[PDB]
Amino acid sequence: GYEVHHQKLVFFAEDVGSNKGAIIGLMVGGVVIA
Amino acid sequence: GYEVHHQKLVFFAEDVGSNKGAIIGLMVGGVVIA
Amino acid sequence: GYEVHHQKLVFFAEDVGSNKGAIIGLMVGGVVIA
Amino acid sequence: GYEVHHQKLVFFAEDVGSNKGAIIGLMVGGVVIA
Amino acid sequence: GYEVHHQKLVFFAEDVGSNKGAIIGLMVGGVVIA
Amino acid sequence: GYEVHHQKLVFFAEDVGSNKGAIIGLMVGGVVIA
C-alpha cells in the first residue's frame, strides 16, 4: 500500500514585469539569442 | 493498492505585465531571438 | 506501507523585473547567447 | 550579424519493432498505463 | 559576429525491440504505471 | 567573433530490448510506478 500526493512544482512563482529578453522555463535543445 | 493524486505543476503563477520579449514555458528544439 | 507527500520544488520564488537577458529555469543541451 | 543553422533533434533514430506497450516521444501531463 | 550550427540532440539512437512497458523520451508532469 | 558547433547530446545510444518497465529519458515532476 502506497500513497503519493500533493507534490508541487513551480517555475516562476512571482509576477514578471517589464520583460525585454528571453524568459524560458524549460528548454531542451535549441538556441536562445538575447 | 496504490493512490496518486493532487500533483500540481505550474509554469507561471503570477500575472505577467508589459512584456516585450519572448516568454516561453516549455521549448523543445527551436530558436528564439529577442 | 509508504507515504510521500508535500514535496515542493521551485525555480524562481520572487518576481522578476526589468529583464534584458536570458532567464532560463532548466536547460538540457542547447546554446545561450546574451 | 548572427547565423544559426543545421540544428537537429531526434527522438527515435532506430526502427521500432514488435511493440506491445506505450512508446511516447514527448508527454506533457497525462497518464500512461502499460 | 556569431555562428551556431550542427548541434544535435538524440533520445534513442538504437532500434527498440519487443517492448512491453512505457518508453518515454521526455515527460513533464504526469504519471506512468508499468 | 564566436563559433559554437558540433555539440552532441544523447540519452540512450544502444538499442533497448525486452523492456517491461519504465524507461524515461528526461522527467520533470511526475510519478513513476514500476
From Swiss-Prot, chains A, B, C, D, E, F:
Q: Altering H5R: what's the impact?
A: Only 23% zinc-induced amyloid-beta protein 28 aggregation
Q: Which domain of life is it from?
A: Eukaryota
Q: What is the effect of changing E14K?
A: In CAA-APP; Italian type
Q: Where is this site: Cleavage?
A: K8, L9, F11, F12, V32, I33
Binding-site positions, Cu(2+) 2: Y2, H5, H6
Q: Which residues of the full protein are shown?
A: 680 to 713 of 770
**UniProt-reported outcome of changing Y2F:** 60-70% zinc-induced amyloid-beta protein 28 aggregation
* Organism encoding this protein: Homo sapiens (Human)
Specify the protein name. Amyloid-beta protein 42
State its location(s). Answer: Cell surface
The impact of changing E14Q is: In CAA-APP; Dutch type
Point out the glycosylated residues in this chain: Y2
UniProt site (Implicated in free radical propagation): G25
How this chain assembles, per its entry, is: Interacts with FPR2.
Reported effect, A13G: In AD1; Flemish mutation; increases the solubility of processed amyloid-beta peptides and increases the stability of peptide oligomers
